[PDB]
Design a protein around this ligand. Structure first.
Ligand SMILES: NC(=O)c1ccc[n+]([C@@H]2O[C@H](COP(=O)([O-])OP(=O)(O)OC[C@H]3O[C@@H](n4cnc5c(N)ncnc54)[C@H](OP(=O)(O)O)[C@@H]3O)[C@@H](O)[C@H]2O)c1
Ligand SMILES: NC(=O)c1ccc[n+]([C@@H]2O[C@H](COP(=O)([O-])OP(=O)(O)OC[C@H]3O[C@@H](n4cnc5c(N)ncnc54)[C@H](OP(=O)(O)O)[C@@H]3O)[C@@H](O)[C@H]2O)c1
Ligand SMILES: C[C@H](Nc1ccc(C#N)n(C)c1=O)c1cc2cc(Cl)ccc2[nH]c1=O
Ligand SMILES: C[C@H](Nc1ccc(C#N)n(C)c1=O)c1cc2cc(Cl)ccc2[nH]c1=O
Ligand SMILES: [Cl-]
Ligand SMILES: [Cl-]
Lengths: 412, 415
């Protein structure tokens, strides 16, 4: 009787999201879908036990099966080394996985009619993608201890004359200096992933840069996107009545603020971390922010929540205290992964199910059943009372009962 | 009869803001205050006629008199060179003035109870400052045409060991590469200006950086701020029950979103342009965003609106079409400049007037009289009808009429 789901790579994670992840599987997925799960435990102590090889193996399995669904993981810092007695500060699994796959991470906010938006006008979500988590990760920085010239040079491999550019002549005192870069192939992958994302959604695409200032650096992004668009995607976009345009970031922000949402935005910038995005943080609930890593081909995806492991809630849970952890972004990591699996395999039953679970999630909240973070979006955190929300387990139970009702009603 | 205002440097500007600037002077300032105005025409044609010397002269007058009030100016690009047949693409006057004063531009949103808030919890405004408009302006960028090494080198003037750092080895294909820098003195000015701004407001200060990634580059900002704080400001902050703390930008954004506002934020970042700040663009109109250039000594200020010259409205004005240009940020450039003048001179009458004009501006909007941009904030742009707003001239007349009423009532409340 269960839906034949097919091959899905699953990456288990840490702390509160690891608890919610199991509730999702037990209550929302496994009662209705049978899957050929290729499970990789990306929990912090199994990552330490395999010297982070499990992360690389999981990344390779996604490349092989084209569908990944990942739970939030701990990115180690020095406290985590003291906490778990780690071998070394293992790098972010999110960073390791998208490096190995060569994809673009697109973020999307899950919208509910009763949850106020930062901008009232935004009727459809805005999907934003960044170039390999931002240029901040491709920087080489140092202290200039005193006077002297800082220069950036390019020495051709073919033996042609080197080109030197003056960064700054420090005439008196010191300062700081740094070098950043991008490879053409990485920009091309970013363009292809962005065009594929726009065609799969049936929404227009904008690329934003600061090409008025970084005329050469940002100009290259504008040129590569336009070249790829004209040659390969223009007719396909026209057929769906969508378009692609470059925008100076100044105009893009003003435009996005006056729009109704419903577009893809390839944002060329320095910091692609969701944590430092004031609009992502201003929505009031990181629990509603999902992410999808899309590839140039448009055939491989890895879906995960944009939020972290929710350590503060995990500490309450460890003491037997009630929590109200929002599972929506984690649920949409499963629905987005399953929707892609269903598309690749022409599995109408799995496609129907994946959409129904997203609908049930939104309808539950729209009917006034929600976690504390969402009740705080409506009333303001100081005005929230216990009767305004459901705890983590009550909310999962409500979704499970509404999903059973949705699928029972559908049989007719 | 009129208030003796004292010495104020005035910089006239361009397009729609120049029109509003004159309406402010005629209707809101000159009927009540007498000023020793040191006027500099920073209009695009006069800047071109003096080869941008007027900009430098204005900056020097600000240093002497300590109070500047500036109108929005055109920053020339290739289209403007063609438009006005300019001799060269003159640099941003805002950038030139900031560079001469060694100041930091702090932005503040003007709040009206009836204009919806972006974050409900923000009961007090957040004042944000950037480092010399962001590092994007201190970049040297180029195309890497093909395979090869990109390296960044430092060659000491004293002849000691040259240090080379690999930016990237381009093995297959090309790409792009760039170098950015900051001078210590510029970071020190930024720290001093930020500490002075926090002390003058009586609000705590946060510096944000990405020092987890740019450990050397951003670490230098954290170190310079802490050094200066401990050496010249800790006791003064402690006396006012305020504090200074560095924050990783990730934590600062989460903290700011859960706060009540009421703090100064020195934001170390790449792009300090207001027009690419989603929060500045997300709340109200840029007509409600004012700015103040503050200097390391905490004595000199230059106030101006954070928005531009509003060229789209100027084109409507040039063709006799009605406009609805918000003058609030420009008015607050005058009130903030005059409030500083009053503080420096202990001029209670000018301090009282500057505050009364800010109150009249906010009260007018709160009583339902506003420009189209503000009516669209409340109703949503599609639902705005002509009867929901006042045109540029009607709004200035209403403010003028309400200012006359405010000052008449103040006199009648005496005895
Ligand atoms: N922050 C990120 O986006 C992120 C991404 C990947 C990995 N990580 C890892 O996650 C771990 C914890 O990071 P963190 O605590 O800084 O960030 P976090 O897990 O995203 O939690 C920060 C706070 O946001 C709220 N929150 C986040 N997700 C929520 C949800 N599903 N439902 C309800 N509230 C939610 C909670 O606020 P209240 O405390 O007000 O309830 C929570 O304490 C770290 O080890 C980090 O390496 C973080
Ligand atoms: N000195 C400065 O403070 C400064 C700052 C920024 C730019 N600039 C210069 O100003 C010129 C115009 O640049 P820009 O168009 O990007 O900037 P802008 O003048 O800020 O105008 C952009 C748009 O923002 C809205 N807007 C801004 N201020 C407004 C106000 N007072 N009332 C109502 N709406 C307002 C309008 O939107 P709608 O079109 O939807 O009505 C306007 O078209 C350029 O020459 C630029 O260099 C100078
Ligand atoms: C992916 C995310 N999407 C949304 C965030 C918040 C809200 C609200 N309210 N909505 C509707 C989004 O779609 C997003 C949007 C965004 C928009 C602008 Cl103008 C600037 C930065 C943004 N960053 C985001 O992460
Ligand atoms: C100077 C400006 N201040 C305000 C903008 C918008 C609103 C609203 N609503 N308020 C209250 C401000 O104080 C500002 C704040 C800001 C805050 C965050 Cl979290 C991020 C970026 C910001 N940029 C701004 O320009
Ligand atoms: Cl950025
Ligand atoms: Cl930035």
């Amino acid at each position: 009787k269960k839906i034949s789901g097919g091959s899905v790579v699953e990456m288990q994670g840490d702390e509160m999201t690891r608890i919610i992840w199991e509730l999702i599987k037990e209550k929302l997925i496994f009662p209705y879908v049978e899957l050929d799960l290729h499970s990789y435990d990306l929990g912090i102590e199994n990552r330490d036990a395999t010297n982070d090889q499990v992360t690389k193996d999981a990344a390779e399995a996604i490349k092989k099966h084209n569908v990944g669904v990942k739970c939030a993981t701990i990115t180690p810092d020095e406290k985590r080394v003291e906490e778990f007695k780690l071998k070394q500060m293992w790098k972010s699994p999110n960073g390791t996985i998208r490096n190995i796959l060569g994809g673009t991470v697109f973020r999307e906010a899950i919208i509910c009619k009763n949850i106020p938006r930062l901008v009232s006008g935004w009727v459809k979500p805005i999907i934003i993608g960044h170039h390999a988590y931002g240029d901040q990760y491709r920087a080489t920085d140092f202290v200039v201890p005193g006077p002297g010239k800082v220069e950036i040079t390019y020495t051709p491999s073919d033996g042609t004359q080197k080109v030197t550019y003056l960064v700054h002549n420090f005439e008196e005192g010191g300062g700081v200096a740094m070098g950043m870069y991008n490879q053409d192939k990485s920009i091309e992958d970013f363009a292809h992933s962005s065009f594929q994302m726009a065609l799969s959604k049936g929404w227009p695409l904008y690329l934003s840069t600061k090409n008025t200032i970084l005329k050469k650096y940002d100009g290259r992004f504008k040129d590569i996107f336009q070249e790829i668009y004209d040659k390969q995607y223009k007719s396909q976009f026209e057929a769906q009545k969508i378009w692609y345009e470059h925008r100076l970031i100044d105009d893009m922000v003003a435009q996005a603020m006056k729009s109704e949402g419903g577009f893809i935005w390839a944002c060329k910038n320095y910091d692609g971390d969701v944590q430092s995005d004031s609009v992502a943080q201003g929505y009031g609930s990181l629990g509603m922010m999902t992410s999808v890593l899309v590839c140039p081909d448009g055939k491989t995806v890895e879906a995960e929540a944009a939020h972290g492991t929710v350590t503060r809630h995990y500490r309450m849970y460890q003491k037997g205290q009630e929590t109200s952890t929002n599972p929506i972004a984690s649920i949409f990591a499963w629905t987005r992964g399953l929707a892609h699996r269903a598309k690749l395999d022409n599995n109408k039953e799995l496609a129907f199910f994946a959409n129904a679970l997203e609908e049930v999630s939104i309808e539950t909240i729209e009917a006034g059943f929600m976690t504390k973070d969402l009740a705080a979006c409506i009333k303001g955190l100081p005005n929230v009372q216990r009767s305004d929300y459901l705890n983590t387990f009550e909310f999962m139970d409500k979704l499970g009962e509404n999903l059973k009702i949705k699928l029972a009603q559908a049989k007719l």
